[PDB]
C-alpha cells in the first residue's frame, strides 16, 4: 500500500528513544534494603525477677 | 463552510438543514451563535435530505428559523486539567464560577467509550476512608459505585464533605461534585459552605472541582451534565493516574432527565414512563466508572427513590449497577450518632470474607451479630426490664451499647459544625478498635467516655480523663 | 513489570500519532497526484478483472 | 514442645479442677499460648524467602 | 517489538478487494438506518457499514431496507455506504473457543489469542425435532446437596433458576461450573461437559472479576465465556444468547455433552424490549413486546438431549431469571416458567436468614429431574423431598400445640435444613453426598444436637474416609446401594454417631 511505504519510512525515520531512568523510578520505587530490626527485647532477664517470683508466688488456693 | 439553517424549533428539538456532503455525524455538537451567547445542539438523528434533528442544551426561546449554525464536529469538548480544580463549570463547559476562562490544557468529548474488558482491573481493592462505620461494615472500594441513601441536609452534604477531607488524606486526590438537578438555592449554600470548609480554596488548593447543573437548565442539558462530570474525572484517572471520587446528586433526576429526552425524541416510552434506552444510557454512565490500570474513579451517587418503591424501574436499574449502599438514617442521627449511618441498614458487597480477610470479616460479623441481637432484644428488654436480661443477654446489651457509642466519631469537616474535633481513623486502626471491643478489654468504661471518640487506643486516654 | 508494560503502551500511542503525522504529510504531496494515477491504472486492472 | 505445652496445659487444667494449682499459672499458660499461636501463623506466614528470577 | 507488531498489522492489511455492491444510508438515528439499494440483500443478512460496524437487515421493504445497527450509533451517519457481508448472521463456532472470552460477533474481548474456530454458524437455527430427541439419562451434579437430590438435574435438560437480584445469583450456577471438574478435569470425555457461561447485561468490571475467579479455579481451560456486558449495545445483547447457543450446538452436534448457562435472560428481555420500542412495534404487556414469548421460546428450545442417532448430543440449559422486586408472577418470569422445565426458586428471606446460598425447595420443581439421578442418590434421598415438604407443613402450623410425633418431625426437619446448608464455592463430590443424606434420612441428626450439625458433617466425612473409603469407592463405582452397602452404611453411620 501507499500506507505500507509510508509506515516503513515513518518507523525508520522516527525512532522513539527510551524513557529516562528517573521517570521509570518515579513510577517504581527502587530496591529494598535488608530489614535489619536487629536485637528484639530481652526475655525474662535475670533471676532478680525469679527471686521476686519465688517469694511472691505461694498464692495457690485449695 | 459547514453551515446550516434552522428549519424547525418545535420545543427544544431543533432540526437543522445543512448544505449537502458536509453533514454532521450522530452525537456531534453544533453551535448557534446567539445574542444569548451560543446554543449548543447535539445531533441525535439524521432526517435525510441534508437535514438532521438535533436537541438543544440551552434555552431555545426567541430562535428564528434560518439562523446559520456551525458544527463543532463532535460531542461537546469540555476543558479538563488540574486548572479545573476548584472551578464551577457549567455543562456547556464554561466557567460559572466567574473566575474567568479556565486555563484549558486539553478538552475532551463528553462521550467517551467505557474502558476495555482487557483493561479492567481483575480484582477489587478497598478504598480507605476515615469513617470507622464505613470501614467496618461497608468498606469503600476503588473503582466502585457506592450509592448513598438516606436523609438530605441532615448532615448529608457534610457527609459528602467529610469524604472530600478524607480523600485528601487517603490519596491526596481530587473530587468532582457533580450536581444534576440541583436547586440553585441549595447550590449557593454548597459553594459557600465548601469554600468555608476549605475543600475549595479559591486562593489555593482545591480537591473538589464543582459542576453544578440547575433544574432550570433544559432537560437535555440536565441529561448531559453527568457525562461532562465524568470527563473531568477521566482526566484525573487516565492522565493524572489519580484515584478520585465523583459525587452525583439525584440519579433519579438523571433518569428523569433521560426519560424526557426520549419522549422529546418521540420514542415510545418504556414501562413506568422511563426511556426505552433506560438501560443503555445508565449503562454508559456507570461503565465509564471503574478501576483502570492508570487510576480509578469511584462514584458516590444519591438515589432518590420515587415513592420509596424499590420495585420501581428507576431504582431497580440503579441497584443493579451499585456495589454497596450506605443507608444514612435520621433515627440513628437522633440517637446522637454522627456518622448518621444506620449500620444494620447499610449493606455492602465490598464487605466479603475473602475481600477484607477473614479476621476483618469475623470482627465485622460479630459486630453485626451483637448489634443485630441487641436491637431486637432491646425492643422487649426496654418494656420487660433489664432484670429480665440473662447474664448472656446483658453481656450482649452491654457490648452492643459500648459499640453503639463507639461507632460515632466526629468528622473533620464538622469540627466547626458540631464544635467537636474531627476523627479520621485509619482502616488498620479501625479493625483494631473493634477487635478490642469484641474482646471487651476496655469494655467497662463509661458509655459517654465512648461517645464521639476515635479508635480504641485513642479512647483509652479519653476514658481516663472523661471518667476523671 | 507494570511500568514496562505501560511503557509499551505509551510507545505504541506515541508511534501511532507519528503515523498520523506522516499521513497528513503524504496526502499534501503530488503523491496525491501520482498515487491517484496508481489507483487509476489499478482500477483499470480491477475493472478488467470483471 | 508445643504439643507438650498443650497436653500438660490441659492436664494442669484438670489437675487444678481438683486441687487448684492455677491462680497465676494459667496466666503463664495464656502467655505461652499467645506466642505459640503466633508461631503457627508465623510458619504459615512464610513464603519463599528469595526473589524469583527464573520466570520473573 | 511495538514496531514489529505494527509492521505485522500493516503487512496483514495489504492488498485491495473486489467490491461489487453497496447501498447508501438515507436516514439514521434511533439505532436503525434506512439504506437505499441493496436489492440483492438476503433476509437477516449481515451488512458491514462504511463506519465498519455490522448490522442485521430487519425490514426488507420495497424502497428501503432497514438495517439494525449492532451497536455504535456515533460512527454511523447519513450517506454512508453499506456493503453486504453476503452471509446470514453467523458467529465463529469451534473447539478453540475454549478458554476465550468473546463478544457477540466473536471478537475476543479478553483479547487472549486470535479466534480458533472450526466453522461459523447461523445465529438462528432450527431446534431438534421430536424425532431426533431422546430423553435424559445422565446426571449433572452441582455439589449442592439440596440441588442434587431435592431438585435433581440431568443432562440436556432445561432447568430454570429464578430468584431475586444480586444475591450472588450467579454464584449458584458458578458452583455447578466449578463442580464440573470431576468430569471436566475428569478424564472421561463421555462424561465431559463443555460449559458456556453467557454473561448478558452485567457490569464489565464484575464480569472481569468473575473471569479472574474462573481462572483462579483454573476452570477457564474447560469452559467458554460469551460476554455481552451492560455497556455493550442492546442489539448485540439481543443477538447474544442466540449466538451463544450456536457455539454450544457445535459441541452438541459432535455428540459431546455440554452445558450452557444463560445469565440473565431477564436482561435479554430488557434488551429485546428496547429494540422493539426503538423499532416502534406496539408495546406489549408491561411494555415488554408482544413477540417476547417467541424470543425466549425459540432460544430455549434449541437445547436438548439428542438421540442415539444424533450421537446422544446434550446441551444442558440453565436460564437464570432475575425476578424484579421478587415478583414471581411477573409477566416475563411466568412466560419463562411455562417454557422451562422445572424452576429453582431461591428465597430472599432465607438468604438473609442465614444460608448463602439459600435454595428454597418449596418453590423448586424439576419436571423430569429424578430420572437422571444416580440410583444411590435416589435410594438414600428417598422421600426426603416429601419429608421436607412435611417439615414445610410442620413449621407452617408450629406457630400452637405440638404432638410428640410433630416434635420429632420438627427436630428432624430443622436439623435436616441445617445439613442442606453450604457456603459459596465449596462443592461436594457425588460420592460424598450419598452418606450425608443417608444419615439424615436414617434420622441420625436427631442424634446430633442442632449446634453440632456442622461438626457432624465434616467429621462424618473425615470419619467415613478413614473408617473405610472402600465403601465410598463402592458407591462411586456401583452408584447404587446393595443390601450389603445399605447395612455397611447403617453400621458405619452408627459407628460415627457414637464417636
Q: Give the SSE order of chain A as H and E letters.
A: HHH
Question: Total strand count of chain A, please?
Answer: 0
Quaternary class? part of a larger assembly
The helix fraction of chain C, in percent, is over 70%
* Largest interface, chains and sizes: B-E, 51 and 50 residues
As a percent range, the share of strand residues of chain A is: under 5%
The percent range for strand residues of chain C is under 5%
Largest sheet of chain C: none
Shape verdict of chain A? rod-shaped
Number of helices of chain A: 3
Tell me the helix content of chain A: 40-55%
Q: Provide a count of the helices of chain C.
A: 2
Q: How many angstroms separate the termini of chain C?
A: 54 Å
Categorize the overall geometry of chain C: elongated
Main location (chain B): mitochondrion
Protein name (chain B): ATP synthase subunit beta, mitochondrial
EC number (chain B): 7.1.2.2
Catalytic activity (chain B): ATP + H2O + 4 H(+)(in) = ADP + phosphate + 5 H(+)(out)
Structural commentary:
This is part of a larger assembly, with chains A (62 residues), B (468 residues), C (50 residues), D (56 residues) and E (499 residues). Chain A has 62 residues and is mainly alpha-helical. Helix content of chain A is 44%, strand content 0%. Chain A is built from 3 helices and no strands. Chain B folds into 3 domains: 75 residues, Thrombin, subunit H (Beta Barrel), CATH 2.40.10; 275 residues, P-loop containing nucleotide triphosphate hydrolases (Rossmann fold), CATH 3.40.50.300; 118 residues, Bovine Mitochondrial F1-ATPase, ATP Synthase Beta Chain, Chain D, domain3 (Orthogonal Bundle). Chain B is built from 13 helices and 17 strands. Chain B starts with a strand and ends with a helix. With 50 residues, chain C is mostly helical. Chain C contains 2 helices and no strands. Chain C is elongated and about 55 Å long. Chain E contains 16 helices and 16 strands. Chain E is elongated and about 85 Å long. The chains are: A mainly alpha (62), B alpha/beta (468), C mainly alpha (50), D mainly alpha (56), E alpha/beta (499). Chain E: One of its GO terms (molecular function) is proton-transporting ATP synthase activity, rotational mechanism.
Summarize the structure.
This is part of a larger assembly, with chains A (62 residues), B (468 residues), C (50 residues), D (56 residues) and E (499 residues). Chain B has 13 helices and 17 strands.
Features:
part of a larger assembly; 5 chains; D: 56 residues; mainly alpha; 2 helices; E: 499 residues; alpha/beta; Elongation Factor Tu (Ef-tu), domain 3; Rossmann fold; Lysin; 3 domains; eight-stranded mixed beta sheet; six-stranded antiparallel β-barrel; 16 helices; 16 strands; 36% helix
Amino acid at each position: 500500500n501507499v500506507i505500507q511505504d509510508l509506515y516503513l519510512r515513518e518507523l525508520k525515520d522516527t525512532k522513539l528513544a527510551p524513557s529516562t531512568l528517573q521517570d521509570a523510578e518515579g513510577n517504581v520505587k527502587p530496591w529494598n534494603p535488608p530489614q535489619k530490626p536487629n536485637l528484639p527485647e530481652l526475655e525474662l532477664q535475670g533471676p532478680e525477677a525469679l527471686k521476686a517470683y519465688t517469694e511472691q508466688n505461694v498464692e495457690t488456693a485449695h | 463552510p459547514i453551515t446550516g439553517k434552522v428549519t424547525a424549533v418545535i420545543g427544544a428539538i431543533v432540526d437543522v438543514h445543512f448544505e449537502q456532503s458536509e453533514l454532521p455525524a450522530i452525537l456531534n455538537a453544533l453551535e448557534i451563535k446567539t445574542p444569548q451567547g451560543k446554543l449548543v445542539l447535539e445531533v441525535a438523528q439524521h432526517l435525510g435530505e441534508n437535514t438532521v434533528r438535533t436537541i438543544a442544551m440551552d434555552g431555545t426561546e426567541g430562535l428564528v428559523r434560518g439562523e446559520k449554525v456551525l458544527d463543532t464536529g463532535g460531542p461537546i469538548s469540555v476543558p479538563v486539567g488540574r486548572e479545573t480544580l476548584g472551578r464551577i463549570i457549567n455543562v456547556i463547559g464554561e466557567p460559572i464560577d466567574e473566575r474567568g476562562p479556565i486555563k484549558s490544557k486539553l478538552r475532551k468529548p463528553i462521550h467517551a467509550d467505557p474502558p476495555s474488558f482487557a483493561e479492567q482491573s481483575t480484582s477489587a481493592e478497598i478504598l480507605e476512608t476515615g469513617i470507622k462505620v464505613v470501614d467496618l461494615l461497608a468498606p469503600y472500594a476503588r473503582g466502585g459505585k457506592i450509592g448513598l441513601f438516606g436523609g438530605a441536609g441532615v448532615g448529608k452534604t457534610v457527609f459528602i464533605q467529610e469524604l472530600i477531607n478524607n480523600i485528601a488524606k487517603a490519596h491526596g486526590g481530587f473530587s468532582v461534585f457533580t450536581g444534576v438537578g440541583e436547586r440553585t438555592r441549595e447550590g449557593n449554600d454548597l459553594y459557600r459552605e465548601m469554600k468555608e470548609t476549605g475543600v475549595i480554596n479559591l486562593e489555593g488548593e482545591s480537591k473538589v472541582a464543582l459542576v453544578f447543573g440547575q433544574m432550570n437548565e433544559p432537560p437535555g442539558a440536565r441529561a448531559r451534565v453527568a457525562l461532562t462530570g465524568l470527563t473531568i474525572a477521566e482526566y484525573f484517572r487516565d492522565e493524572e493516574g489519580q484515584d478520585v471520587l465523583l459525587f452525583i446528586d439525584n440519579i433519579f433526576r438523571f433518569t428523569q432527565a433521560g426519560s424526557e429526552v426520549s419522549a422529546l425524541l418521540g420514542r415510545i416510552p418504556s414501562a413506568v414512563g422511563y426511556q426505552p434506552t433506560l438501560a443503555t444510557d445508565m449503562g454508559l454512565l456507570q461503565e465509564r466508572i471503574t478501576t483502570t490500570k492508570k487510576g480509578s474513579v469511584t462514584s458516590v451517587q444519591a438515589v432518590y427513590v420515587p415513592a420509596d418503591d424499590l420495585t420501581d424501574p428507576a431504582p431497580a436499574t440503579t441497584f443493579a449497577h451499585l456495589d454497596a449502599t450506605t443507608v444514612l438514617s435520621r433515627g440513628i442521627s437522633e440517637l446522637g450518632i454522627y456518622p448518621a449511618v444506620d449500620p444494620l441498614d447499610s449493606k455492602s458487597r465490598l464487605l466479603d470474607a475473602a475481600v477484607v480477610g477473614q479476621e476483618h470479616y469475623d470482627v465485622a460479623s460479630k459486630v453485626q451479630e451483637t448489634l443485630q441481637t441487641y436491637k431486637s432484644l432491646q425492643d422487649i428488654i426496654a418494656i420487660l426490664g433489664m432484670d429480665e436480661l440473662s447474664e448472656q443477654d446483658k453481656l450482649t446489651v452491654e457490648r452492643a451499647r459500648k459499640i453503639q457509642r463507639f461507632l460515632s466519631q466526629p468528622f473533620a469537616v464538622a469540627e466547626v459544625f458540631t464544635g467537636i474535633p474531627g476523627k479520621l481513623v485509619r482502616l488498620k486502626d479501625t479493625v483494631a478498635s473493634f477487635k478490642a471491643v469484641l474482646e471487651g478489654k476496655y469494655d467497662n468504661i463509661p458509655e459517654h467516655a465512648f461517645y464521639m471518640v476515635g479508635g480504641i487506643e485513642d479512647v483509652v486516654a479519653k476514658a481516663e480523663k472523661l471518667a476523671a | 513489570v507494570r511500568y514496562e508494560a505501560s511503557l509499551r503502551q505509551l510507545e505504541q500511542r506515541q508511534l501511532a500519532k507519528s503515523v498520523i503525522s506522516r499521513v497528513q504529510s503524504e496526502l499534501g504531496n503530488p503523491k496525491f497526484q501520482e498515487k491517484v494515477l496508481q489507483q487509476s491504472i489499478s482500477e483499470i486492472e480491477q475493472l478488467l478483472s470483471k | 514442645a508445643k504439643s507438650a505445652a498443650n497436653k500438660l496445659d490441659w492436664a494442669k487444667v484438670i489437675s487444678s479442677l481438683r486441687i487448684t494449682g492455677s491462680t497465676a499459672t494459667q496466666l503463664s499458660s495464656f502467655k505461652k499460648r499467645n506466642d505459640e499461636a503466633r508461631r503457627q501463623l508465623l510458619e504459615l506466614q512464610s513464603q519463599p524467602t528469595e526473589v524469583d528470577f527464573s520466570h520473573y | 517489538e511495538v514496531s514489529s507488531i505494527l509492521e505485522e498489522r500493516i503487512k496483514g492489511v495489504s492488498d485491495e478487494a473486489n467490491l461489487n455492491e453497496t447501498g447508501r444510508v438515507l436516514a439514521v438515528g434511533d439505532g436503525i438506518a434506512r439504506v437505499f439499494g441493496l436489492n440483492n440483500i438476503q433476509a437477516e443478512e449481515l451488512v458491514e457499514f462504511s463506519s465498519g460496524v455490522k448490522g442485521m437487515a430487519l425490514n426488507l421493504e420495497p424502497g428501503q431496507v432497514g438495517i439494525v445497527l449492532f451497536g455504535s450509533d456515533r460512527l454511523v451517519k447519513e450517506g454512508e455506504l453499506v456493503k453486504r457481508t453476503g452471509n446470514i448472521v453467523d458467529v465463529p463456532v469451534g473447539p478453540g473457543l475454549l478458554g476465550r472470552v468473546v463478544d457477540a460477533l466473536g471478537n475476543p474481548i479478553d483479547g487472549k489469542g486470535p479466534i480458533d474456530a472450526a466453522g461459523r454458524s447461523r445465529a438462528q437455527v432450527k431446534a431438534p425435532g421430536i424425532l431426533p430427541r431422546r430423553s435424559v439419562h445422565e446426571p449433572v451434579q452441582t455439589g449442592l446437596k439440596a440441588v442434587d437430590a431435592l431438585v435433581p438435574i440431568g443432562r440436556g435438560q432445561r432447568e430454570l433458576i429464578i430468584g431475586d437480584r444480586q444475591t450472588g445469583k450467579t454464584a449458584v450456577a458458578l458452583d455447578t461450573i466449578l463442580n464440573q471438574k470431576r468430569w471436566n478435569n475428569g478424564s472421561d470425555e463421555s462424561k465431559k461437559l463443555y460449559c458456556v457461561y453467557v454473561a448478558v447485561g452485567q457490569k464489565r468490571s464484575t464480569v472481569a472479576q468473575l473471569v479472574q475467579t474462573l481462572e483462579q479455579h483454573d476452570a477457564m481451560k474447560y469452559s467458554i465465556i460469551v460476554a455481552a456486558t451492560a455497556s455493550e449495545a442492546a442489539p448485540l445483547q439481543y443477538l447474544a444468547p442466540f449466538t451463544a447457543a450456536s457455539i454450544g450446538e457445535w459441541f452438541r452436534d459432535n455428540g459431546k455433552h455440554a452445558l450452557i448457562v444463560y445469565d440473565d435472560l431477564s436482561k435479554q428481555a430488557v434488551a429485546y424490549r428496547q429494540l422493539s420500542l426503538l423499532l416502534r412495534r406496539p408495546p406489549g404487556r408491561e411494555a415488554y413486546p408482544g413477540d417476547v414469548f417467541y424470543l425466549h421460546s425459540r432460544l430455549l428450545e434449541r437445547a436438548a438431549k439428542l438421540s442415539e442417532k444424533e450421537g446422544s448430543g446434550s446441551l444442558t440449559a440453565l436460564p437464570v431469571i432475575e425476578t424484579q422486586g421478587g415478583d414471581v408472577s411477573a409477566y416475563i418470569p411466568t412466560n419463562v416458567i411455562s417454557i422451562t422445565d422445572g424452576q429453582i426458586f431461591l428465597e430472599a428471606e432465607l438468604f438473609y436468614k442465614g444460608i448463602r446460598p439459600a435454595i428454597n425447595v418449596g418453590l423448586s420443581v424439576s419436571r423430569v429431574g429424578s430420572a437422571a439421578q444416580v440410583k444411590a442418590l435416589k435410594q438414600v434421598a428417598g422421600s426426603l423431598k416429601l419429608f421436607l415438604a412435611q417439615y414445610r407443613e410442620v413449621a407452617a402450623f408450629a406457630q400452637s400445640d405440638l404432638d410428640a410425633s410433630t416434635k420429632q418431625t420438627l427436630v428432624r426437619g430443622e436439623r435436616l435444613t441445617q445439613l442442606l446448608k453450604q457456603n459459596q464455592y465449596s462443592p461436594l463430590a457425588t460420592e460424598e453426598q450419598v452418606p450425608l443424606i443417608y444419615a439424615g434420612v436414617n434420622g441420625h441428626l436427631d442424634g446430633i444436637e442442632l449446634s453440632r450439625i456442622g461438626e457432624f458433617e465434616s467429621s462424618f466425612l473425615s470419619y467415613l474416609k478413614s473408617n473405610h473409603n472402600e465403601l465410598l469407592t463402592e458407591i462411586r463405582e456401583k452408584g447404587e446401594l446393595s443390601k450389603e452397602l445399605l447395612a455397611s452404611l447403617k453400621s458405619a453411620t452408627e459407628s460415627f454417631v457414637a464417636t
